Design a protein around this ligand. Structure first.
Ligand SMILES: O=c1[nH]c(=O)n([C@H]2C[C@H](O)[C@@H](COP(=O)(O)OP(=O)(O)OP(=O)(O)O)O2)cc1-c1cc2cc(F)ccc2o1
Ligand SMILES: [Mg+2]
Length: 540
DNA sequence: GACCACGGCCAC
DNA sequence: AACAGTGGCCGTGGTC
């Protein structure tokens, strides 16, 4: 409907657009349109009509702003109805769902998408009248952030391609050595990547005992948790775990990332998805740069392929024990506050208990293990499972979990307060009022209910940490531009910046402090910073 | 070619 | 595998 009016559109219209593909840095702009009033404007030529707009306002605004930066046009994103819906309910994650929940249909034509962004904005902005805290998250965090992420997306990161090509051939020859040493240990060749075939070999032809089953189809599981408990029980299980790590890293990172360098930028560009998680975290895709390996030695080799441009340095900043400090603030547990008001490290302490060694002896491989253990226990891992992780008695793990929550008694009072409040209001909230609707808290099936409970009390603390990080990013981005530095990646509690060599020390010291004082809590936020030519040695 | 479900596994 | 939570991508095995 509306009324075809001649392009250009008046100021502050709502833009709709169609891309050749979902990735803004790689897409052709097929159609461009705008609407304000009862008028829909359609562009004769989309790439020239981008010159006319002063701001991107509408569904998926960040995406068009990214494509604009790719053509050297500073066109910042503004209002996006997706961002309002996502603050109303974080299950509002795609425009198909949002339009089919607030009064329209998400089609494939720019004009119709423009007019939809106009009405979708009116509706949701009305639904947020009086939700002053969500209106605060919108004006102060989420809408500014979409601009920051647009500049991150369009900048990209430099990758050592020749090095990854070379690493590919090396890993390939090693995969072949393990494959053959499994085909032999099994008396024949089969597809080692087919989990079904491997099931028959491990559990039928050989004699190994099936520890567990898969969720949907009830097959015998060949997961690492299962195979780890079948080590020494046969050497072939050890080789399969080696083969699995290598083909994972090769087919997910080593091989596809080099072929994704952009021809204009010479760099690698991810997408930061702003309305994609239930807790408020960002996500990253196409490629996901938030899960580049690091823990294993081959993984470290891959993390080193992410490097600074000629004449710059990477600066890496990572909040320490972030969800535990948030937890101390949220609960008000005094003993836990006192841990951080005294610079204690709960991952290195759990690691010394867990390995026997003195605190001065825990090395990175050990601390990493205690991180997963501590966060495992915190969010409700069963005694029985912990006893299988730590290889201890069951009543020994019950005490580890009773000692853990006894040294900080006020936490369980907060878990319970959080749950009871969620049953009454239907949602739980972070420190700034970001909310997750958790309807299954009154479920009558125990398993469905207790899962709802674990998602329910995790969200306030993980979404508070993500709120801090996002706010730090909007406070830091303007200061980095003064110094001529840039933001590259965010990995949940961590930032990577690129800075000129003769300014790196300055941007590190600065960025460290903006992050630490983003929002004073009842506990000091520490940050670790490092500088290097590559992502790995930046992280000290 | 394009989707999809599933088990599996990388990061935080 | 499971009474830890949050993501996204892979190959396999299908269907259309
Ligand atoms: O299993 C987990 N479950 C979970 O819920 N998280 C959340 C809570 C954290 O606060 C937050 C930030 O992760 P993080 O930065 O790595 O942890 P942290 O800030 O507490 O520690 P430090 O920076 O001081 O080393 O992710 C993290 C982990 C986890 C285990 C682990 C092992 C590694 F080898 C490397 C990274 C790891 O992540
Ligand atoms: Mg951290």
């Amino acid at each position: 409907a509306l009324e075809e009016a001649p392009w250009p559109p008046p100021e502050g219209a709502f833009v709709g657009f169609v891309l050749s593909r979902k990735e803004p840095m790689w897409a052709d702009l097929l159609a461009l349109a705008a609407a304000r009033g009862g008028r829909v404007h359609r562009a004769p030529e989309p790439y020239k009509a981008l010159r006319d707009l002063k701001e991107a306002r509408g569904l998926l605004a960040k995406d068009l702003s990214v494509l604009a930066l790719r053509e050297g046009l500073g066109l910042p994103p503004g209002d996006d109805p997706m961002l309002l819906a996502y603050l109303l309910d974080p299950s509002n994650t795609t425009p198909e769902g949002v339009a089919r929940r607030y009064g329209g249909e998400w089609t494939e034509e720019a004009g119709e998408r423009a007019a939809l962004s106009e009405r979708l904005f009116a509706n949701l902005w009305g639904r947020l009248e009086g939700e002053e805290r969500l209106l605060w998250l919108y004006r102060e965090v989420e809408r500014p952030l979409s601009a920051v992420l647009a500049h991150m997306e369009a900048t990209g990161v430099r990758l050592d391609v020749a090095y990854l090509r070379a690493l590919s051939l090396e890993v390939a020859e090693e995969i072949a050595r393990l494959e053959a040493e499994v085909f032999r240990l099994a008396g024949h060749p089969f597809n080692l990547n087919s989990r079904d075939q491997l099931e028959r070999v491990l559990f039928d032809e050989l004699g190994l005992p099936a520890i567990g089953k898969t969720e949907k189809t009830g097959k015998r599981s060949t997961s690492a948790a299962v195979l780890e408990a079948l080590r020494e029980a046969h050497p072939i299980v050890e080789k399969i775990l080696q083969y699995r790590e290598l083909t994972k890293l090769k087919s997910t990172y080593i091989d596809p990332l080099p072929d994704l360098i952009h021809p204009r930028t010479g760099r690698l560009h991810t997408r930061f998805n702003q309305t994609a998680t239930a807790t408020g975290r960002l996500s990253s895709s196409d490629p996901n740069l938030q899960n580049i390996p690091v823990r294993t030695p081959l993984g470290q080799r891959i993390r080193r392929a992410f490097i600074a441009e000629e004449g710059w340095l990477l600066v890496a900043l990572d909040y320490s024990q972030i969800e535990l400090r948030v937890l101390a603030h949220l609960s008000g547990d005094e003993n836990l506050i006192r841990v951080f008001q005294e610079g204690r490290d709960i991952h290195t302490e759990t690691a010394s208990w867990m390995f026997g060694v003195p605190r001065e002896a825990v090395d990175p491989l050990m601390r990493r293990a205690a991180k997963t253990i501590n966060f495992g226990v915190l969010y409700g891992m069963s005694a029985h499972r912990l006893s299988q992780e730590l290889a201890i008695p069951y009543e020994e793990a019950q005490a580890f979990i009773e000692r853990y929550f006894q040294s900080f008694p006020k936490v369980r009072a907060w878990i319970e307060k959080t749950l009871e409040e969620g049953r009454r209001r239907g949602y739980v909230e972070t420190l700034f009022g970001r909310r997750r609707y958790v309807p299954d808290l009154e479920a009558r099936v125990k398993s469905v209910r207790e899962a709802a409970e674990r998602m329910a009390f995790n969200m306030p603390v993980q979404g508070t940490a993500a709120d801090l990080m996002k706010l730090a990013m909007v406070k830091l981005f303007p200061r980095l531009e003064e110094m001529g530095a840039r933001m590259l990646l965010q990995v949940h509690d961590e930032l990577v910046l690129e800075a000129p060599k003769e300014r790196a020390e300055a941007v590190a010291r600065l960025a460290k402090e903006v992050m630490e004082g983003v929002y004073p809590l009842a506990v000091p936020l520490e940050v670790e910073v490092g500088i290097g030519e590559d992502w790995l040695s930046a992280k000290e």
